[PDB]
Symmetry: C3
Subunit: 137 residues, 3 copies
Amino acid sequence: GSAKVAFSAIRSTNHEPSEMSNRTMIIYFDQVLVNIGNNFDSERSTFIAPRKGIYSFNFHVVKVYNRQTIQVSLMLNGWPVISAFAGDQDVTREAASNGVLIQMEKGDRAYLKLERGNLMGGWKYSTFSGFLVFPLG
Amino acid sequence: GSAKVAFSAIRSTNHEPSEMSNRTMIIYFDQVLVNIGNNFDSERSTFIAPRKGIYSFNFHVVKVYNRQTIQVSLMLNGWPVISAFAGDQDVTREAASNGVLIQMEKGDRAYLKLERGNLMGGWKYSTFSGFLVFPLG
Amino acid sequence: GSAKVAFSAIRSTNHEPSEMSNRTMIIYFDQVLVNIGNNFDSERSTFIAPRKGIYSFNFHVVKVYNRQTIQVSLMLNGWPVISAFAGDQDVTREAASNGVLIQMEKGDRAYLKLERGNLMGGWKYSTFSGFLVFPLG
Ligand SMILES: *[C@@H]1O[C@H](CO)[C@@H](O)[C@H](O)[C@H]1NC(C)=O
Ligand SMILES: *[C@@H]1O[C@H](CO)[C@@H](O)[C@H](O)[C@H]1NC(C)=O
Ligand SMILES: *[C@@H]1O[C@H](CO)[C@@H](O)[C@H](O)[C@H]1NC(C)=O
């Protein structure tokens, strides 16, 4: 129906991963700046496509020193589409960043999963946003 | 009025920060590749939203070795929305990168500020662009 | 004609650069996830603008340890518009990332070129996507 669809969420705290997050390995975002269409489930940090079309996605997952290197991936219905990486050192914060355009059908689910390493020490300043570029008949 | 709004600017030189830039901590971009709507003030390196809607922003701030780590932030009317970080070493250039979708009202101002560290040694190859995803009634 | 234009391609293998890639220094993407309008030449990894308008581009070129630092650039008809950099170490994968909005005329060619260093060891997980923001009369 609506051709105006976009979401944007950020991690605004250094707080540690939850017990459920330790299980699902899905990255949570507490603050949702944008959510037109209400298609982003903030409770599960997942975007569900309301219709067929081309969707844009971008993420930047920031971490601190924690004796661990990480690999983040954008999951599409349980399968990784793109991935990003970050090293580990006590000099500065570093980010695993990537973006992509993909075709999603109505009901397709998009979310970020931590494939390697952990986010102990928090992942403040992390970002995850997306929008509908255009629908498809 | 116009639903076609986008800007794109780059730093095309290794030249040092200005005296005024040393005061405002705002990151300047000398070369403006795109500026449809003329809503980007190149003199102040700030984007002023012409109307209510969802806007996309992306930036990549590149630096060189200068004994300093930096923190860059996208400011919305003086308040930081998102941030990015870069270490410091004499091996290669590195970039503080991030992006986000946000809702802006008519008159809202968007720009990049250097919250920590300095850009002594220039910040060539740096980028800052944005566009109107869609307006809101 | 069509105002719906977007492409998205990824590198899905650690395989080494080809003999022809060693000559052109152009970065190849074997898997094309999106190609609405069919304006992206997968054989040459180049996007040809079908009409006048503002186009968005984003790329993330991932590499491994190979005793080499790299510089990647988005070429517009043989000239670099933006650039990105990545160091070199055996700790983790790292990415040269950047994005930009640019005005392209009908026939203008956009592609990624490796200006410095090599991608020996493969460039798996690399991404390159773009879309038409809006056309211009
Ligand atoms: C999650 O796992 C880490 C180990 O990687 C552990 O230190 C932490 O306490 C766990 N968090 C919870 C809430 O159980
Ligand atoms: C800006 O401040 C730096 C110190 O961080 C100084 O070295 C530089 O000369 C200053 N630039 C100007 C134009 O005053
Ligand atoms: C490309 O050049 C590298 C040297 O940088 C060489 O090791 C490699 O074998 C070359 N690839 C081909 C296919 O010739």
